[PDB]
Structures are given as C-alpha cells and as structure tokens.
Design a binder for this molecule. Structure first.
Ligand SMILES: C=CCNS(=O)(=O)c1cccc(C(=O)Nc2nc3cc(CN4CCCCC4)ccc3n2[C@H]2CC[C@@H](CO)CC2)c1
Length: 295
C-alpha cells in the first residue's frame, strides 16, 4: 500500500472508488499508448467511460506504477484535467475508469482537422490553448509538476464545436514520483531540466510554449528535421523555433516568453492565461487565416 500525497493530503489504494467488475462493460478498443490498450466502456442510461487496462502479464513494478497512476488522477479536481470515475483493481485485468474523451488526442486531432479543400480557425486554437493553460495553472497552484506537457498528452471532449481540451496523461510525473535516455521528452524540456535534472513549475511553462507551437503549427513535430541531441545542443546554445506558418505575432511572443533561458524570466500560468485572453480578444489575431493544406 504505497501512499500518495498531493496538495498536502495523503491517499492510498483504500481511497480509490472501486467499481464492481459486473457493472463494467467494454464496447470497443480506442487504441494504445505504451501502457496497455484503452477501451470505450460503460458503467452501470449507463455512464460512458474510457477504460485503461493493466496487462495481466506484467512486473510487480508495473502493478505499482498503475496503482500510482490511479491515485494521481483521482486526487485532481479540475475541468481541464480528465476525471477519474473510479477503478476496478480487485479483478483481472485491472482497470482505471476515466472520463471518456470522444475527440481523442490533440496531436491527432490537429493533424486530421487541418483546413483543406473552414474546419478550424485561430479562435479554435486559442480556446484549446486557454483550456490547457487553465489545467496547467491548477497544477501550478497545487505545486504539481507535470514534466510532459505535450499535444500527445492532451485530449478533446468531442471533435466538433464546443470541444474542451484537457490534460489526459500523467505517466512521466508517475515515473518520477516512483523513482530511459531515449524516451525522455527532450524536445519539450528546458535547459536546466535536461542538464541538471532540476524541475519546477517554470519547467511546465517551457513545455507549454512547445505545446503552443504544436497547436499553431496544426500538429507538426517540434524542431523539424532535428534529432533529440541536435535539439538539446540547439536549445542549450540559445536556439529557438521559428513561428509556425501564419502564426500571429502576439501568439508567437507567448512562445518566446515561455522559452526564456532563465526560469525566472518565464511567465507563470496566470500571466500566460492573460496573454492568451488578450490574443483572443484581438481582431487582428483572430481574423488571421490558417494555411490550407493541399488535398
Ligand atoms: C492522452 C493520453 C491517454 N490517456 S488515457 O489512456 O489515460 C485516457 C484518459 C481518458 C480518456 C481517454 C480517451 O478517451 N482516449 C481516447 N478516446 C478516443 C476516441 C477516438 C475516436 N476518434 C474518432 C474520430 C474523431 C476523433 C476521435 C480515438 C482515440 C481515442 N482515445 C485514445 C487517446 C490516445 C491513446 C491513449 O492511450 C488511445 C486512446 C484516454
């Protein structure tokens, strides 16, 4: 029974809301991460959920990783962080039950919803950014360092208008709480993080800058044509990404403030939200056309 502490309150497996296995039905696979497979499920107007599964063939450490993931997500309480409905850890395979996000991951969304021969506008992108910044502000307020803010780790409620973006994966924070080189999110990390292994909330500010780039580029990989080591040396020597195609100046300037070399010179998330809000109200920003991808 490992204990988990967040916002000064401690929790253990006993605090998790166990849902009887017979109340849970799987409908379809939704895809996989590195972390087993994810299904759409229903809990008994049944409740629609996402079901994250633990492989039955796994190590004792995978078991503990999965428990810790459950405790981490269960203690958050915020509209831009996916809810945990409960868990079913007393039958096999073990389940974590999460808010179903019918729009899928943000990176995939951006790539698949690129304007082609009116799907997205600048304001859609700014709303996604606001939503994630709101989730990041909540983490910062509660002294939680995420360590992997990236489009692949964000989810959307629905594909269409009204979509809300939320932070959906806490795997890196989980690994560090419980503590390879080639798996580190180098391209989202600030100098002091990959050099000294020093993480603070100004670490997540930097990563959020990179997420902003991903959003306004409509889902491109950061630092096009650069490998991890090339990015590490580029960033460490003061190198910064160029603006995404058609990116308004005021939105680019949020990215460049997020990427200040010294953590002290980076904005906190209250300031980032203020700047996103200003961009959102500015006609010259929101009237900028996104590029149309030829097809
Ligand atoms: C962001 C990482 C996933 N973290 S999670 O597995 O703990 C999680 C938590 C809460 C919800 C979800 C979830 O709903 N995932 C999910 N829903 C998907 C829906 C679709 C349907 N598409 C139809 C066409 C329009 C776009 C949506 C597709 C994939 C969906 N996923 C994925 C997210 C990425 C991976 C994560 O393992 C698989 C599950 C996933």
């Amino acid at each position: 029974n490992p204990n988990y502490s967040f916002a000064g309150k401690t929790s253990s497996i006993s605090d998790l809301k166990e849902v009887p296995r017979k109340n849970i039905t799987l409908i379809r696979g939704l895809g996989h991460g590195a972390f087993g497979e994810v299904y759409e499920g229903q809990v008994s107007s049944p409740l629609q959920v996402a079901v994250k599964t633990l492989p039955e063939v796994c190590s004792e450490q995978d078991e503990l990783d999965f428990l810790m993931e459950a405790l981490i997500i269960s203690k958050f309480n915020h509209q831009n962080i996916v809810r945990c409905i409960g868990v079913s850890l007393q039958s096999l395979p073990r389940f974590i039950l999460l808010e179903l996000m019918a729009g899928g991951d943000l990176k995939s969304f951006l790539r698949e919803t690129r304007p082609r021969p009116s799907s997205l506008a600048m304001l859609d992108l700014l709303h996604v950014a606001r939503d994630i910044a709101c989730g990041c502000q909540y983490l910062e307020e509660n002294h939680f360092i995420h360590r992997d803010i990236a489009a692949r780790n964000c989810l959307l409620t629905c594909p269409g208008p009204g979509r809300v973006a939320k932070i959906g994966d806490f795997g890196m924070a989980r690994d560090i709480y419980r503590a390879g080189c080639a798996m580190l999110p180098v391209k989202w990390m600030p100098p002091e993080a990959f050099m000294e292994g020093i993480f603070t909330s100004k670490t997540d500010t930097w990563s959020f800058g990179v997420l902003l780039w991903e959003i306004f580029s409509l889902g491109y990989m950061p630092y096009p044509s650069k490998s991890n080591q090339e990015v590490l040396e580029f960033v460490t020597s003061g190198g910064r990404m160029d603006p995404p195609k058609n990116c308004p100046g005021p939105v680019y300037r949020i990215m460049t403030q997020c990427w200040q070399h010294q953590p002290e010179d980076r904005p906190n998330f209250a300031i980032i939200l203020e700047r996103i809000e200003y961009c959102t109200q500015d006609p010259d920003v929101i009237n900028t056309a996104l590029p149309i991808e030829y097809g």
